[PDB]
Design a protein. Structure first.
Ligand SMILES: *[C@@H]1O[C@H](CO)[C@@H](O[C@@H]2O[C@H](CO)[C@@H](O[C@@H]3O[C@H](CO)[C@@H](O)[C@H](O)[C@@H]3O)[C@H](O)[C@H]2NC(C)=O)[C@H](O)[C@H]1NC(C)=O
Ligand SMILES: *[C@@H]1O[C@H](CO)[C@@H](O[C@@H]2O[C@H](CO)[C@@H](O)[C@H](O)[C@H]2NC(C)=O)[C@H](O)[C@H]1NC(C)=O
Ligand SMILES: *[C@@H]1O[C@H](CO)[C@@H](O)[C@H](O)[C@H]1NC(C)=O
Ligand SMILES: *[C@@H]1O[C@H](CO)[C@@H](O)[C@H](O)[C@H]1NC(C)=O
Lengths: 132, 231, 535, 115, 122
């Protein structure tokens, strides 16, 4: 529990790791890997309202949790080159399991006002859709 | 008997789902008619038309007025004033109004049917409660699937003041009765609440047969390659 | 984790208290729910007062909770305390079963009632006190003894004639303004922590075991809370009194194993890890001064102490002042390059981030001297002034704007390495530091030496470029105090070489410094420089 | 009598109980709440009036009520009740009760697959 | 990037890292190596040539590279990078970094928490 490898929020998973080294018998140590999953028991499959029942199957692949794609800088000889860090994040299309506390989610519903119908917008997480 | 002048907030259904926004200012106690023409301190088109008066206990006249176009002053925080000149008083009477502050936003809950109604297999009922909001104007509408039900299918009570735990807040309820076959086919119904304090003026909650008293919790978690060179 | 406040708070019964908690000012946090709650045993963390209108039953009439959004703080008041109110508590945001909280400990003690046989003297450590005892003239020629009690025994270790205790060494003097009257006193400077308690004091002794009770209380100072974030700056304000206005003054940091560790002195000391990012200002008339520390990292969190003592360290018997610091680390201050490289003859360009809400400010560019204590000589301002010895090789540019300005420094030499500071004029001040290193190599753009001029005909000056710059724009300019502005008689002849410029007339009116540049529209790049004469 | 919503128990303040009565022909009714055996005073809850419900068969009426009790008393296992009085009931009163059980589900199936 | 073999770590002398790049249509590629953020000199690693692989319909190529480092700073926790440059990649470069924590662990702790409260993931 010391160094954070990933803290992902679309799937809400967190993975840390730590080397704890014995001094006697220097040929064998132990390397620890901790995983924490939080399962939402009341979310839908797609995130809109009328979609489908409760999501009842939750699938986590380690190679898609730890995936890192925002570019980086490498200095080769005397040059700064921009490199990518992953093979697989072609643009979204990822299915998220939870909401994210700093992004806000809306829906569109038709209602009537005597004559014709409008295109009323509706907040789904009200703490984060405040316009300011 | 003696006259008394009152002022009236714009209707909630016209500010949220509408275009126009009329204020209105009435005065009771008028004898037959008068030459009262009202005064309004922002006067950009003060089409203050009155029309035919209404009759009261034992026969009396009460005349009012309107003023159009009140979205941006009312929401930006302007102020308004209404006053008229009339015989049966010493001084002409005045009134003022302002959009309220120190508000709270409602907490919406949608409750599943009771377990006893499900066995009889005629109809079920779904309860929609909104709680803890500071001005006392709300709107309740229902949907089935994604299509809005007409107003005559359900029943909504009025907003009332609940016992005090600090600041003064309000509440409301509503019920809808739907066929007990559609509850087991797997349709969804959802409740919408519109209020001044919410961010985008509406919010919603949804319920169907699986979410809400399920008697069954099934969950599968699959973690694929835990020893898997994570980078 | 990003939430912070006072760890310990104390009061006595019947009094008020006023607690303050801190959160990052993002839009989700200003609009979410705030709570104050009592962490009891058996699991739960029951709420006492909340931001959404909820007041409990036990807190009825005594409390409220106001939220200040532009501060990023929210304050909680509790009137009329008790001894059922002792326990651990929590600030927070959102839902209690998550962890967006911070623990607070509240301790409250009993006051004295129907025991008014006391005489108190309030003091903070490092100042003077008096302990007055009744001088009786019916013991005219008798010793004015004052014991100390360890347990119940008044121990004969202080006389009032020139005998003092072997632990109270060098600092007991007393004054004579009675001598016929009841008036003597004992004045102590530099109060310790071990100089506390009641003492068996009297003046003259009839032998029948006579007593007197009079205490002192000396108090340790309470730290002002400072809330900072990653890659920002802090300022302390040491404001001791004029009693120690000419002593050496210091500033350290309390650590784990009872070891204060020096950060600065006024006798010229510095940590190794604070090179290039610290200042210490010369004091005013009354003895207060400022300390700036910029570029704050994760491990700067902890209690800090400023004081005054004759050798420049923390020793007992010296007046102190305190602060407690928190580094947020969920910051919105943008990242920047910490080191930028160049070669001898080349240029550099720096990105300098400020706040968008302070865009009508005035911008400055320092150079950290590090000689005396720390000092910024200003090099260039946003209003049109530059230093003398940096003429022809420095300018400040407002582009790209909207979060960031840039500064160009060319004609480098190997002594131009150092640490450099940038600072705005607004209310919130991030101070950002970048290190210029010098490594060896060759300049990309290529210009001749120092170009003369003929009297009565034209000049032309070339300027190459390599082939990675083939997609970047090219320009020339003439440098003055406000910056340098592009010229329209350039041609950019070749597809991958030889940007040039001519001057149609040799008179003295433009006998200045010129540059040759590269930019991707907004962001700027490398340049070189040559000076023109007229013979 | 309906159990409290599970979104409410996460804030540790007060839980909300809801009583509904539906489908009675003369529109006059009474509503009283309890805790154990102690009848609560009337200044502690809120009941609405008796509107008319929209069917096509006959004319019928409905009414609601809410009561907010403390969270510490809810987690201990205290029970609460709702009583309704009507002209057309045979023994003039009917009662329903609740506690912290009876919203809990009957079985939970979890499976974790390390493959 | 492939982590070192287990049997080569039991002797405490030197360990091998392997970089494998695959499925590219022209016959030109680059491979460099880095320690920490410092590029190692070119005479410390061996790189083979680019050859074409068996046909799954259309023709593609492959290349490999190895680097031997000391078994002290692997176990201490330094980081090593393999960089590859080719014409079809969008930013013309891609990188993979590995260290001892991002490999096969010996112990694994799994904690699954079911949350009836909310679906917001604080
Ligand atoms: C999950 O549910 C959401 C909500 O339905 C899906 O998003 C929306 O899906 C609709 C259906 O095709 C798209 O409709 C389009 O709407 C526009 C108006 O904005 C209209 O002009 C078009 O003619 C079309 O009907 C819409 O693009 C889409 N996105 C929005 C509203 O942002 C979503 O696709 C669902 N995801 C999955 C994987 O099923
Ligand atoms: C930021 O917080 C500070 C906390 O001290 C507020 O300062 C005082 O606030 C009270 C109102 O509760 C005023 O009566 C005082 O005049 C304020 N100043 C001082 C020096 O005590 C401050 O008001 C908060 N910021 C804003 C913009 O309100
Ligand atoms: C509004 O009118 C009332 C009396 O009708 C007066 O007491 C109050 O001050 C007025 N407010 C403003 C803002 O004019
Ligand atoms: C209520 O809040 C005000 C500030 O809004 C504060 O001055 C006052 O002391 C509080 N009342 C109490 C603690 O009784």
């Amino acid at each position: 529990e010391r160094i954070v490898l990933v803290d992902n929020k679309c799937k809400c998973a967190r993975i840390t790791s730590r080397i704890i080294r014995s001094s006697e018998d220097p040929n064998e140590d132990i390397v620890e890997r901790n995983i924490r999953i939080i399962v939402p028991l009341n979310n839908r499959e797609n995130i809109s309202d009328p979609t489908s029942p409760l999501r009842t199957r939750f699938v986590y692949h380690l190679s898609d949790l730890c995936k890192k794609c925002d570019p980086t800088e490498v200095e080769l000889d005397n040059q700064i080159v921009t490199a990518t860090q992953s093979n697989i994040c072609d643009e979204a299309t990822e299915t998220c399991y939870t909401y994210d506390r700093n992004k806000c989610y809306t829906a569109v519903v038709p209602l009537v006002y005597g004559g014709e119908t409008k295109m009323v917008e509706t907040a789904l997480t009200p703490d984060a859709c405040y316009p300011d | 008997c003696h006259p008394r002048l009152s002022l009236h907030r714009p209707a909630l259904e016209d500010l949220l789902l509408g275009s126009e926004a009329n204020l209105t200012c009435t005065l009771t106690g008028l004898r037959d008619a008068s030459g009262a023409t009202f005064t309004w301190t922002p006067s950009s088109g003060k089409s203050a038309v009155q029309g035919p008066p209404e009759r009261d206990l034992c026969g009396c006249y009460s005349v009012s007025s309107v003023l159009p176009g009140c979205a941006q002053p009312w929401n930006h925080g302007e102020t308004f004033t209404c006053t008229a000149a009339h015989p049966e008083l010493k001084t002409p009477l005045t009134a003022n109004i302002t959009k309220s502050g120190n508000t709270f936003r409602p907490e919406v809950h949608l409750l599943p049917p009771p377990s006893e109604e499900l066995a009889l297999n005629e109809l079920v009922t779904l309860t929609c409660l909104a709680r803890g909001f500071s001005p006392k104007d709300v709107l309740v509408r229902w949907l089935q699937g994604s299509q809005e039900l007409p107003r005559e299918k359900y029943l909504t009570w009025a907003s009332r003041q609940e016992p005090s735990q600090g600041t003064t807040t309000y509440a409301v309820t509503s019920i809808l009765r739907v066929a007990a076959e559609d509850w087991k086919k797997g349709e969804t119904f959802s409740c919408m609440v519109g209020h001044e304090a919410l961010p985008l003026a509406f919010t919603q909650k949804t319920i169907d047969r699986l979410a809400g008293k399920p008697t069954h919790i099934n969950v599968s978690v699959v973690m694929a390659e835990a020893d898997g060179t994570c980078y | 984790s990003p939430i912070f406040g006072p760890e310990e708070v104390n009061s006595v019964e019947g009094n008020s208290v006023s607690i303050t908690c801190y959160y990052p000012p993002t839009s989700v946090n200003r609009h979410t729910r705030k709570y104050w709650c009592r962490q009891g045993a058996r699991g739960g963390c029951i709420t006492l007062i909340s931001s959404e209108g909820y007041v409990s039953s036990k807190y009825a009439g005594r409390a409220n909770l106001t939220n200040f959004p532009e501060n990023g703080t929210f304050v909680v008041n509790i009137a009329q305390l008790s001894q059922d109110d002792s326990g651990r508590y929590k600030c927070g945001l959102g839902i209690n079963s998550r962890g967006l909280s911070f623990d607070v400990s509240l301790e409250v003690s009993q006051g004295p009632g129907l025991l008014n046989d006391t005489k108190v003297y309030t003091v903070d450590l490092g100042r003077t006190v008096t302990i007055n005892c009744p001088f009786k003239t019916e013991n005219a020629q008798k010793r004015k003894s004052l014991y100390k009690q360890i347990g119940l025994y008044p121990v004969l270790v202080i006389d009032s004639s020139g005998y003092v205790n072997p632990n109270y060494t060098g600092r007991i003097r007393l004054d004579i303004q009675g001598t016929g009257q009841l008036l003597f006193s004992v004045v102590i400077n530099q109060l310790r922590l071990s100089d506390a308690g009641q003492y068996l004091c009297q003046a003259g002794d009839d032998s029948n075991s006579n007593k007197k009770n009079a205490d002192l209380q000396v108090l340790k100072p309470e730290p002002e809370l400072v809330y900072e974030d990653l890659r920002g700056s802090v300022t302390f304000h040491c404001a001791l009194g004029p009693e120690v206005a000419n002593v050496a003054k210091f500033l350290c940091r309390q650590s784990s194993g009872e070891n204060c560790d020096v950060v600065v002195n006024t006798l010229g000391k510095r940590a190794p890890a604070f090179e290039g990012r610290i200042l210490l200002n010369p004091q005013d008339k009354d003895g207060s001064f400022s300390v700036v520390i910029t570029g704050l990292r994760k491990e700067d969190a902890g209690r800090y102490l400023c004081g005054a003592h004759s050798d420049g360290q923390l020793q007992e018997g010296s007046p102190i002042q305190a602060w407690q610091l928190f580094v947020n680390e969920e910051s919105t201050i943008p990242r920047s390059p910490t080191v930028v490289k160049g070669v001898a003859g080349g240029s550099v360009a720096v990105l300098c981030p400020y706040n968008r809400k302070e865009s009508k400010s005035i911008k400055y560019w320092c150079l950290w001297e590090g000689a005396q204590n720390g000092r910024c000589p200003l090099l260039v301002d946003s209003e049109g002034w530059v230093k003398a010895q940096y003429e022809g090789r420095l300018s400040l540019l407002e582009e790209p704007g909207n979060g960031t300005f840039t500064v160009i420094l060319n004609q480098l030499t190997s002594r131009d390495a150092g640490f450099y500071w940038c600072l705005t004029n607004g209310d919130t001040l991030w101070r950002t530091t970048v290190e210029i290193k010098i490594i060896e190599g060759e300049p990309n753009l290529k210009v001749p030496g120092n170009v003369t001029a003929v009297l009565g005909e034209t000049l032309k000056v070339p300027c190459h470029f390599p082939c990675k710059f083939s997609s970047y724009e090219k320009y020339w300019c003439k440098w003055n105090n406000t910056g340098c502005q592009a010229l329209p008689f350039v041609n950019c002849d070749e597809n991958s070489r030889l940007v040039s410029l001519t001057l149609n007339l040799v008179t003295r009116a433009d006998e200045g410094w010129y540059w040759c540049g590269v930019k991707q529209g907004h962001f700027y790049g490398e340049t070189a420089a040559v000076y023109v004469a007229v013979e």
